[PDB]
């Protein structure tokens, strides 16, 4: 790999510099090189990996959405479709890269925190592939996303308190899957509601080092429920 000659610690340091510089493709490349050293990631490093790729793919998703909307408004020349397909292919290549790292290196064994986080990540990037998929593929990707989310859900309910931010973020994203991808708004609404209600019922489990993250997700669950009702 392009990062093969660089020390793991230097790769982590440069990922942090790239985040500060808002160079998220660089940051993702550095974090990929760090993963490929084959050691586990700490919580801080998992956050760098997460932030990097989510920034890269988020810009691709937002571009895809602009072009796809132009494409559909023009169905009421080949250039819009071609350019949309070009962005789509790039997005799928980024999702394939992330899913490959998860399967090749990251998902194992290990923290319950870390196992849940990687399975949630797997669900997310299958979901991003599902946003642009069609046909025989699309059903494959959707079941892949569900299976990853559902395994993460089982572990999280077993091993983490109901305010844990990975637990909450996973439940938030799983409900978005139900609503936006699986077309199961009742499933999405019931998951969002019980997730929020169970966090409030066990509010006392907020952690000193992550309570701002937890309460942010609880509010996002409530915003989705208002949107959906």
């Amino acid at each position: 790999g392009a990062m093969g000659s660089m020390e793991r610690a230097s790769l982590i340091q440069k990922a942090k510099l790239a985040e500060q510089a808002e160079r998220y493709e660089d940051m993702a490349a550095f974090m990929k090189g760090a993963v490929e050293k084959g050691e586990e990631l700490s919580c801080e490093e998992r956050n760098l990996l997460s932030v990097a790729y989510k920034n890269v793919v988020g810009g691709q998703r937002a571009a895809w959405r602009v072009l796809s909307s132009i494409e559909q408004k023009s169905n009421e020349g080949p250039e819009v479709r071609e350019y949309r397909e070009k962005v789509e292919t790039e997005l799928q290549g980024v999702c394939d890269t992330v899913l490959g790292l998860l399967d090749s290196h990251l998902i194992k064994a290990g923290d319950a925190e870390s196992r849940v986080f990687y399975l949630k990540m797997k669900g997310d990037y299958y979901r991003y592939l599902a946003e642009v998929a069609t046909g025989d593929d699309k059903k494959r990707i959707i079941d892949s996303a569900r299976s990853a989310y559902q395994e993460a859900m089982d572990i999280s309910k077993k091993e983490m308190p109901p305010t844990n931010p990975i637990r909450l973020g996973l439940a938030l994203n799983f409900s978005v899957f139900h609503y936006e991808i699986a077309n199961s708004p009742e499933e999405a609404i019931s998951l969002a509601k019980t997730t929020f209600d169970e966090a409030m019922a066990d509010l006392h489990t907020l952690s000193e080092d992550s309570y701002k993250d937890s309460t942010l997700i609880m509010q996002l669950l409530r915003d989705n429920l208002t949107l959906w009702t």
Binding site: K54, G169, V176, E180, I217, L220, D223, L227
Partner: peptide, 10 residues
């Protein structure tokens, strides 16, 4: 308006 998923922090 689409649903909100987990954001980037820290």
């Amino acid at each position: 308006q689409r649903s909100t998923s987990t954001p980037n922090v820290h």
